[PDB]
């Protein structure tokens, strides 16, 4: 089990507990649900790189108290 932070554009941070080998898919769904958006609207990034539902903390080599950044769509 490790703890991950999800940091959003409004300054909020939400904590999640996850096992090193669980795919991130359900944490991402839980995050979209708890703040009311869809997967198609939220970009998940770790160290600035795209994060996919298939990925696990182990494969991304996350540590306890690491932060995932979340952003909404940008247009110009």
């Amino acid at each position: 089990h490790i703890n991950l932070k999800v940091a959003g554009q409004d300054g909020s941070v939400v904590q999640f507990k996850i096992k090193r080998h669980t795919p991130l898919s359900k944490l991402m769904k839980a995050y979209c649900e708890r703040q009311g958006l869809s997967m198609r609207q939220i970009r998940f990034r770790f160290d600035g790189q795209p994060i996919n539902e298939t990925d696990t903390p182990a494969q991304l080599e996350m540590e306890d108290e690491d932060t995932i950044d979340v952003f909404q769509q940008q247009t110009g």
Partner: protein
Amino acid sequence: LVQKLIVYPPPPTKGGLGVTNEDLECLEEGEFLNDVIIDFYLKYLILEKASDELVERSHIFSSFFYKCLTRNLSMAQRRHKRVRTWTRHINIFNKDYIFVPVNESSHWYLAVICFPWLEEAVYEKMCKRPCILILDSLKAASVQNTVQNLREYLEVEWEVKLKTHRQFSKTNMVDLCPKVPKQDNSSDCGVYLLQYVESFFKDPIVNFELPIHLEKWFPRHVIKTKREDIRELILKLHLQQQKG
């Protein structure tokens, strides 16, 4: 029903970006490009169009880097802490060109940090200078604020990775706006950003004497067909990825 046309780069490669049919909608004429198309095409340029020398001397930040940066410690340190892990395996002080896509007030433009390892201009007989280039297809009011935020990012990144004090100021890292080809409508800012990066990889700026004349950097026909060219590229990659 939204379905993903491509993941780029595709698995097993890590870090792939999903592009959906909904993302393709922003390539129609008159539509604002979104972050997915920008980030996809910039990764395509570095993986398939940049020379091998340019890849080693360049770094391209995600289009969310600047947005994340600007979302005990000083205010500069506080901004830097938000993006501190985005250079985990990168020494930007060993790069010649650092590309920063900027979206401010629904307008794309490009900042390029050039030769940050230099401390002053040097001639050998081309002129190379430490500086921040602003490449903008329209005109953005936030330019001076962007440039100062990037100087302050460099100072903290330097102190964190090199563990000495180094100042980045207007005299040390001047801001320049090359004369680039400009927009003729109200919605093609993102297409020009992509063309500026593409043309930089084909013909990098190596003489920094002012003014930097880039008015003929690319022909008119390439920008007029770029939206269609990007769409056709994504459809070709889609058919390739169906096969595997």
